[PDB]
């Protein structure tokens, strides 16, 4: 079905601890495939998935150059932010950026994104129309005027409609055996007596990809969402994910409870 | 600006059984700012050579990281994760439970 590609920038200034640090990660769906850290000895964009290693050298030199220029320009962006808010040069501040594209089953653009945050709060975002900006405050309005006078939205639109989608489709073809294969969850149920009259039933889903999953406990076919404890989906470290759902039930009534899993990889 | 405390999960990569290799993970998520200190502990002592993923963040801008190391669970070995953040006055220790 639908797929996605995203890049995450984090720039962190640190007075007295060296120049600001810059980190970039790239994701196709829930799979990390590229990384960069300005604090590296010889900073370069490095592969993190097998199917991205087939890219020749020129790709890696180009991406590394992009990342070094991004390092410098986001140091300047941190300086500009400190100027806009009349903040002190002794404090640490963070600029974040998410951008990329969502494509549908036909492989063409379905939605674009380019959002920037400062100190954890929204700074400026690119609206759905790929042609206008949403600003968070007055400083963001200064940035928005600078960018709409520079016709930034059109270049963002050109990238998101073009290179984003094409490169994402190439990545999907190169890694079709992992990115387009759905790993169904392996599920089981554990019992834990919490007292003499209650027992905790925990339903486990392990080793599934992608991360989207729905785990519900049912009692006599009735959803127990009000009574279910659900942990946030977590990575296993092998590019798969884990989740569990727990309910406390009266002893001797366990047979009324069944776990229900919804995942793309299950028929 | 903004201060968000980290949520912590400690867990194995595969269902734990004593005697076979596995991976111990500490997943920290939902925190801000980014500076954080994460250690894995075996019977209270810090494990060296623990790896950690690259800094990323969710749709709400809060950061997440995965610290991990190879380990062989036993009946008596106790494992934990110690996390320090600007929002924590003292480090928080979360013990590993094979059932969670």
């Amino acid at each position, epitope marked *: 079905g639908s797929h996605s590609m995203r890049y995450f920038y984090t720039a962190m200034s640190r007075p007295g601890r060296g120049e600001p640090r810059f980190i970039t990660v790239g994701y196709v769906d829930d799979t990390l495939f590229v990384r960069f850290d300005s604090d590296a000895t010889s900073p370069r964009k490095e592969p993190r998935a097998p199917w991205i290693e087939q890219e020749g050298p020129e790709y890696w030199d180009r991406e590394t150059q992009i990342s070094k220029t991004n390092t410098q320009t986001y140091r300047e962006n941190l300086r500009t932010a400190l100027r806009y*808010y009349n903040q002190s040069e002794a404090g640490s501040h963070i600029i974040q950026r998410m951008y990329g594209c969502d494509v549908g089953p036909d492989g063409r653009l379905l939605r674009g994104y380019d959002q920037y*945050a400062y*100190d*954890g*709060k*929204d700074y400026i975002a690119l609206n759905e129309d790929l042609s206008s900006w949403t600003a*968070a*405050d*007055t400083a963001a309005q200064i940035t928005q005027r600078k960018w709409e006078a520079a016709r930034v939205a059109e270049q963002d639109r050109a990238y998101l409609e073009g290179l984003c989608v094409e490169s994402l489709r190439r990545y999907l073809e190169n890694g079709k055996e992992t990115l387009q294969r759905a790993d169904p969850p392996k599920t089981h149920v554990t019992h834990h007596p919490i007292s003499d009259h209650e027992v905790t039933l925990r339903c486990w889903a392990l080793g599934f990809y992608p991360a989207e999953i*729905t785990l519900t406990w049912q009692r006599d076919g009735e*959803d127990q*969402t*009000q009574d*279910t*404890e*659900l*942990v*946030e*989906t977590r990575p296993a470290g092998d590019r798969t994910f884990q989740k569990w759902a727990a309910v406390v039930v009266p002893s001797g009534e366990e047979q009324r409870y069944t776990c229900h899993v919804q995942h793309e990889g299950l028929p | *600006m*903004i*201060q*968000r*405390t980290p*949520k912590i999960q400690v867990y194995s990569r595969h269902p734990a059984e004593n005697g076979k290799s596995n991976f111990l993970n500490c997943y920290v*998520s*939902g925190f*801000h700012p980014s500076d954080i200190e994460v250690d894995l502990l075996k019977n209270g002592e810090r494990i060296e050579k623990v790896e950690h993923s690259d800094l990323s963040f*969710s*749709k*709400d*801008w*809060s950061f997440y990281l995965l610290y991990y190391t190879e380990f062989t669970p036993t009946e008596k070995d106790e494992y934990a994760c110690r996390v320090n953040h600007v*929002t924590l006055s003292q480090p928080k220790i979360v013990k590993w439970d094979r059932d969670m």
Partner: antibody
Amino acid sequence: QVQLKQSGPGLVQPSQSLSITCTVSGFSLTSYGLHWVRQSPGKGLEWLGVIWSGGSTDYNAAFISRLSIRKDNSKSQVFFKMNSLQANDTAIYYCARSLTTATSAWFPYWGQGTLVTVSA
Amino acid sequence: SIVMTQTPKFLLVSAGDRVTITCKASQTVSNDVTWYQQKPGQSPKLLIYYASNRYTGVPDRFTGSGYGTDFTFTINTVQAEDLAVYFCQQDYSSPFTFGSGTKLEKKR
């Protein structure tokens, strides 16, 4: 248009639990966090907790021993549950949402409120 | 836990004069301060956020200012519809504490 509609009993016995359902329209719980605040004469406005888009939660430390916030994304419902209620807890309870998907804890959007009285 | 101290508990006002409400944080709180207005029987209504940014549809009379610890909420020309309770709230750190509130009442 963002809409938070609350439902729940307004009278609970002074030891039992309080359950409030906030039903959401105009946005998806998979994208926004939902917070719970209360207002009482003794303590004024109190932020109680939040459930984020991914299902993780944050609780007011003074309430963490008896508070739970759960949700059903597909049904757009958030379930606030608080245990061991006393006379302190009689108050108006609100669900609330921030402006954006960030972790901001200020609210342009409030539920209509649920007055709960704790009495036997 | 950061404590927000809302200076005036009540203000006797006549239509036409400036009101100034103060909110002091126990610890530094950056610009993460919000101002609400509440009328009897209703939920709080957002007025100011990020210390000085006006929410959509909030009239020009209302104004927020401040950074760090001392914050100020001003109504430049009070109108009869402004008789209500006003609250500050910090967003810096949990539990995102609210001020005690300032009740505006009619002077006689």
